[PDB]
């Protein structure tokens, strides 16, 4: 296992192209002059997330590699969008796989999934994250934010836009440095010395509800609770977990590079022991995945699949383990919205823990037999790739038999032509079953996207500023991180976003109004036009150039080098400007 | 009819004709209202455009925002496909929800060859969109001298 | 000893809760992924200061620990207030104790305490700070800033606010990049290439005085000197030092973790020798603290709320005792008001005592141990001030942390602390001097801005909070050049307009319609209690408690009782052992 | 009304030291000793909710209507922070139920703001002017509307 350093950044509400062109490319162009670097790869997702992986030669000091990666990243940091900097860019040196999963449930059923996830994020995640040997912690859920769910009808009723809401929240949820009475230098003889306390961070939905948006000329008040629903809610709503079918959250913990797995596991349990006596009523830690005795199941739906459709497939996966394998399976920890390949509405994972070794006698009751039967039964599931695999056993197979191919755009051809070149290579590879079997892309397919064009002339003619248009569109349909507040003594985020029912259909675009310079409210349809088009939900890049990862295995008998040789021959006949390289195993 | 939507998109002629030989709906639509004719005109698969129209595909099918397969072909420079659609009865003056005609999309991308074919089939050169712009205003705003004189 | 990395940041004019909730929690939440971290502790002060101490496992490379902390802090920098970023944050790997103190006096008495402090800050501190082995340098004083002391009466008379002053300073104390004549790419045949020089930083009180604020409608001009007094003065006025009663400044130097104490001191002395030939007339280096020992310290801690003037009175009696009663043993006393053994504040002080040569102090009663205890006994009869003398090398009972584990809050944690403190007092046979290490809540002035009235009058809440903060807390505006060196510019109310609650009503803010509105028209105020110093331990609110085993009782026995006592505390209150007890 | 042992009593009354306040009161300590902000031992006892000390000081003649430098009385503090028992005893001993501070804020206003329903009823029971307005023209009912406290608006 070569050591890898990972850069992760978040851009809420951003599409894959926006992420790649305002974050990923800026960082990648600075990732040079780094010692012992073998290759670099990155994903830019329409979840607004980017992950850049830098893989180093075996024997590299992970400490040095993280330091050299971060120092180059500092060159890009001031060029990144403020929305990205505010989320906190992370640089980590961890294994790619989970060492353990700490599950959390409420046996009294007095806490929802949202409640449990917030308790874990606010009372558990940080101390685990600071434990030595812990390289990465993935929360299976989301910490609470103060959610302001805007209503475009009420906002238009009072000549207000999300810009006014965002401005009032910054002004009335503020932590003011106000000085002192009798501070130095004083008038000599001063006796009184006391800090001046002015505004402080709001702490509750009640306080946010009474933020004052405007005073009508007749004296009436427009409060924030008059144009929005206000509640605690997740920073995002993408990741939801279940433990044996009951609501749950948890921490996925990855091992830091070179750290001792047993010592780190013991420190984590020791840290958990400090927190248990202060759990609220009914909360309980469970251990659904300890690294055979365990395995995972990946769930991949086509891009564009909703969270509701992914939940149906996870339900079928969980049902199988809870009924067909109930004599072997001890527990299932299923996560919707987080997958082997990262995060997205169309992915999921299940961690399966088996009963005791002596409690499962027989050939048919071992991990390989169980995962084989599971994957065969899940072969039945259509419109979803589902595979059950024990992690060390598929690494072995792949390493011995598979290859990792990168199709690279080396001439500015663009995403669509790179797709065409990929499909040409895939269809031609299907004409050689004697040497190549199951040649497949590792990424996602293009999906319909809603392209809206802001007419600059109409906006200028009406007196509507572009900043107000983009802020209104982005805050309502994507959400906007406004500032921080204090939830039960802990700093947390405040988000504004449209209530769900006003950001579901394309005609909802016309329900949103922007105030012009002369005070008139202008609907979005007055200065915009829209059309459907296709675009990528996950743009890949390899060594700084657009790329598409293609995986496959040698045919039965033929060696790895013979399968790689044919791929190079096939690649030589692709359109001009399309190159290739070998990564992962094949490197 | 979902398998035919997938077939008309990935450009696999053989599969497609199996589907209407099996009776798949030639006018099936995905969630954004794109028929297989839309998908074929977008990615520029001429043979499937001809086959689908042969099996009674709606040549004037609209998506959820009022765009027709002629809009997509005129926009993305598919001269072979704009001809095949116009001979089968594509409304050359079809307006989407924004008042955008295929002449607008063709003029914006500088597809002068498609602009001629559109004009030849009776495209209203004076057609405006919701913003009152015609194909000539597009040529002036883009600086396309040649396209500008083809609209007089 | 386990190595410790210290983060320090400052928020001018912020209270302890403001510091904790905009800075300290943000940094703590992003100290993840660092190797070998034992524990983390923090103080957030109403001086506007945060200090976060990250202690690592024994054997940890201090170089690695510092770099990992710095890198994580770099990624969290965009999350901090701009006012904190622009002050500069420091990350240090040094001992907590002083290796030596470099004292500076003026024998000719031709330089005041503040003159000397600026000279040290501007001509000496930086070269000392770059000396290898120097982990931290404390200036016992402040560098000069350009001080704009605002007058609210004259500001109102000309219908101006501190917002107008700040905007004009940024506009007219600027350094403009203006390009070149014949710059590249040039026309063919160009013959002249020359830099264009536009505005440059101001350099003097006179230049700031003629900053043009507005032209009245009749044609008269309102200059900055018409609404403010302009003078050089310290960035802050909290730290003043004395050497044998005489005005002084100095540098407190701490040894970097793993450096050689002797080699570092010699390098410091060689650096000082380079500076001496260029001192102004009268300036002299004294060496009041060089680590029997021959030296010791005395700490002064008044109750929170005490002024600088009252702390100075206590330091005077401490100094007086060494300069009279211990005449024959004490060589010098270097006393610092506003800086304490732990932290910084108007209610704390420290005195470094240097003894005459060991050969001139014969007898066991004239050695460090006998002198320091005699001093502690003499100072124990001092009313409302903890004063004792002690020792500390360049490189004990128990150390207890009470932890808020369930979001209880400060008030509830205080109550649980007091409940445990009263229970420990009822076991004098086992525990002695069980006390809090921190500070007690004090009266603070809570002012409420009425959002409805402000909007009804057209007064912007940003103008209100800027006016309040700049006047009563001070605001770092931008930089200027003082005798060739970059220094800061501060605006703040002149002292006599920011002393009493009634003064709040003398400050006016301009409404959208151009009318001046006093603070009384849109605000109300009341007294309340709040913390001058908030503590955290491993990311949670905390309160450190010190104590020792009673005579004839083991330390483990005393710790056993403390654990049993803590188990009967209110729900959601935990605890942990730290420091010596870890 | 604007007011060592007197300073010892102010510290004892704050930390809830019932024995020492009895010791100092028996030794001639000033019951109405004020600190720099004008708070008496009765102010601090009402703030930190020390009921026994409240009754001890009023027995020895503590000014029940002591003003601090901003016009606030111990009943203001007791009503503001939900100390119902002390609110009772203060009114028993002649506390001005309609006392206004410099801002025009009454104990009813403070009790209403923090939603201390039982205290609001005790204050009304003793004749609190339900229509008293502060400097901004706000009544206790106005406060309940802005806070969304439907229970309070019904009590009023």
Residue numbers in the entry:
A (entry chain A): 39 to 329, 569 to 864
B (entry chain F): 15 to 166
C (entry chain B): 39 to 329, 568 to 671, 678 to 864
D (entry chain D): 6 to 8, 13 to 165
Paper excerpt:
Upon antibiotic stress Gram-negative pathogens deploy resistance-nodulation-cell division-type tripartite efflux pumps. These include a H+/drug antiporter module that recognizes structurally diverse substances, including antibiotics. The superfamily of resistance-nodulation-cell division (RND) efflux pumps plays a key role in intrinsic MDR in Gram-negative bacteria. These tripartite complexes comprise an RND transporter in the inner membrane that acts as a secondary active H+/drug antiporter extruding a vast spectrum of structurally unrelated drugs through a periplasmic membrane fusion protein channel connected to an outer membrane channel factor across the outer membrane. A comparison between drug binding of AdeB and Escherichia coli AcrB is made via activity analysis of 20 AdeB variants, selected on basis of side chain interactions with antibiotics observed in the AcrB periplasmic domain X-ray co-structures with fusidic acid (2.3 Å), doxycycline (2.1 Å) and levofloxacin (2.7 Å).
We obtained crystal co-structures of trimeric AcrBper in the LLT conformation with doxycycline (2.1 Å), fusidic acid (2.3 Å) and levofloxacin (2.7 Å) by soaking pre-grown AcrBper/DARPin crystals in the presence of doxycycline (6.25 mM), fusidic acid (5 mM) or levofloxacin (5 mM), respectively. Doxycycline appears to bind in a congruent manner to the DBP groove as reported for minocycline8,10,18. The carboxy amide group of doxycycline interacts with the N274 polar side chain, while F178 and F615 sandwich the aromatic ring of doxycycline. Furthermore, doxycycline is engaged in a water-mediated hydrogen bond network, extending from the 12a-hydroxyl group in doxycycline. Interestingly, we observed an additional electron density at the DBP cave of the same protomer, which we assigned to a second doxycycline molecule (DXT-2). This second binding site represents a previously undiscovered binding site for tetracycline antibiotics within the DBP, where DXT-2 interacts with the side chains of S135, F136, V139, F178, Y327, M573, F610, F615, F617 and F628. Largely planar, heterocyclic compounds including doxycycline and levofloxacin fit into the DBP groove and upper cave region, interacting efficiently with polar side chains and hydrophobic residues of the Phe-rich area.
